[PDB]
């Protein structure tokens, strides 16, 4: 108990181990059943503790390495009268273990914490109430994106519709993907050198318009 | 009536029970994940113990634990002991606990919300004001009316566009 699984969960996993022991027992060896059953029972209990206790599941060999690191640090602190540094632990772990490896193994073993962890004496606050949402764009971001699209269309209208269309096809404004020169040339019916040339001249006219009006500079961050 | 008995337990969309990385690079997550994990572990172990033909006592215990898992998931602490994470007396927050109460969904996020274009400060008597007036600090009003201010700055020459004005006010 107290290793991350309920009493009943441990009991059911030991029941699975007991079923295995039953199906693998050989009475001919004159051994009592308990001696063979205890092996599989401990085996199943430990497999369950290793496989289910963590909210972020860790492979069983990695959990064994983590527990070895735990025991090692605990013996080192029981002999040192203080918590050991990464370097002392890497020493005691043997070869192939440098301090950076101990640090990475500890970072990989960090368990998550509850978003419902309380803050304060009277339960008026949660821990999740301080986590900003980074994924969904802010109104400022969406507004800047819309103004960018509108300014790019404002600048793309100063081109002819063909050079504007070539730029839009080549950069992905139209269908979401960027086409090769051969595809834009097969669409407009022109050589890849010609389509790349009108792309260059459209970019050049846009560069001139931008040096003149400076309307798109502020969007470059 | 038989629909009051569950065959397929629904699972909440994951964004409403997030698994997010906080500032320091560590992870914070909702209790519904641990409740669902309890449920799925017990249900999978039941499916296996059935596939292997286990005795009656064992399947009975497994089914009892499965019911109590579903109960903790839907309304923890309602029947029996509340399900707590290891090393803590704190009950886990089930769906019932998310809906009902002072901090529940209705009272906390639906009948009242935190809101944009809002501020607060210490009050002061100001007897020169007419009845229809109040004294608003300049910086408070700048932030509260910020988009209007960006627009009016673009109308005048104070900035080339909205984004330049915002960077200038930063």
């Amino acid at each position: 108990t107290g290793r991350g699984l309920s009493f009943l969960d441990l009991i059911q996993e030991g029941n699975q181990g007991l079923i295995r022991a039953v199906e693998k027992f050989e009475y001919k060896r004159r051994f009592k059943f308990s001696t063979y059953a205890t092996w599989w029972i401990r085996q199943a209990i430990n497999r369950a503790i290793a496989d289910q206790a963590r909210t972020i599941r860790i492979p069983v060999h990695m959990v064994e390495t983590i527990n070895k690191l735990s025991r090692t640090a605990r013996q080192l602190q029981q002999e040192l009268g203080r918590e050991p540094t990464y370097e002392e632990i890497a020493e005691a772990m043997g070869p192939g273990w440098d301090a950076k490896r101990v640090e990475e193994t500890l970072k990989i073993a960090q368990e998550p914490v509850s978003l419902e962890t309380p803050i304060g004496d009277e339960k008026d606050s949660f821990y999740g109430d301080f986590i900003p949402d980074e994924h969904l764009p802010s109104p400022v971001d969406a507004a800047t994106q819309s103004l960018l699209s509108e300014e790019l269309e404002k600048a793309l209208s100063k081109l002819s519709e063909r050079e504007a269309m070539v730029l839009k096809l080549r950069k992905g404004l139209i269908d979401g993907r960027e086409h090769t020169l051969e595809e834009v040339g097969a669409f407009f019916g022109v050589t890849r050198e010609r389509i790349r040339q009108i792309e260059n001249k459209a970019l050049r006219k846009l560069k001139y318009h931008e040096s003149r009006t400076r309307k798109l500079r502020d969007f470059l961050d | 009536p038989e629909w009051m008995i569950l065959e397929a337990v629904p699972v909440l969309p994951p964004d409403l029970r997030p698994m997010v990385q906080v500032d320091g690079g560590r992870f914070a997550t909702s209790d519904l994940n641990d409740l669902y994990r309890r449920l799925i572990n017990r249900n999978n172990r039941l499916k296996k113990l059935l596939a292997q033909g286990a005795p009656e006592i064992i399947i009975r215990n497994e089914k009892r634990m499965l019911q109590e898992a579903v109960d903790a998931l839907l309304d923890n602490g309602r029947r029996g002991a509340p399900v707590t994470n290891p090393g803590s007396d704190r009950p886990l927050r089930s769906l019932t606990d998310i809906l009902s109460g002072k901090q529940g969904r209705f009272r906390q996020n639906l009948l009242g919300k935190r809101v944009d274009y809002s501020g607060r400060s210490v009050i002061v008597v100001g007897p020169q004001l007419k009845l229809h007036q109040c004294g608003l600090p300049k910086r408070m009003a700048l932030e509260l009316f910020k988009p209007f201010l960006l627009k009016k700055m673009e109308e005048k020459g104070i900035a080339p566009n909205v984004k330049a004005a915002r960077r200038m006010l930063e």
């Binding site: 009493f7 009943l8 009991i11 | 006592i57 009975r60 215990n61 009892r64 634990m65 109590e68 029996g80």
Partner: peptide, 14 residues
């Protein structure tokens, strides 16, 4: 009332 007590009783029958 206590599921582990119930199971320990069921175990005590066999």
């Amino acid at each position: 009332s206590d599921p582990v007590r119930q199971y320990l009783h069921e175990i005590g029958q066999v």
